[PDB]
Design a protein around this ligand. Structure first.
Ligand code: HEM
Length: 88
């Protein structure tokens, strides 16, 4: 169970609500569904970014090393290589 899992942006855009909230950070895909109520910055800022890239939003508000480590709980795979050029 160690092989990479790729998701297309097309698929990621469908996961946009509290039953299944995904987003992308630095080409990695996270399922934050069980994190929404735990996030110190609140649920809304996460819901607003669901189904897309939130890398600049994440980096712009100075997330700590502790935040970066914690994000590993929610990683489900990587952005498909063919979609990485869409993330600007
Ligand atoms: C999987 C990713 C995320 C995790 C694990 C996470 C975790 C955390 C943690 C632990 C904090 C407390 C402060 C810190 O340790 O830096 C925090 C604060 C915050 N986060 Fe996140 N965060 C994530 C994604 C995001 C995203 C995508 C946004 C923006 C859309 C966001 C917006 C904020 C804001 C605004 C605060 C509050 C800052 C403050 O008032 O001091 N976070 N986050």
């Amino acid at each position: 169970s160690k092989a990479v899992k790729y998701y297309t942006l097309e698929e990621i855009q469908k996961h946009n609500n509290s039953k299944s909230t995904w987003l992308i950070l630095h080409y990695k895909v996270y399922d934050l569904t069980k994190f929404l109520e735990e996030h110190p910055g609140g649920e809304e800022v996460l819901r607003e970014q669901a189904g897309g890239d939130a890398t600049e939003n994440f980096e712009d508000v100075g997330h700590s090393t502790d935040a970066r480590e914690l994000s590993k709980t929610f990683i489900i795979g990587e952005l498909h290589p063919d979609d990485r050029s869409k993330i600007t």
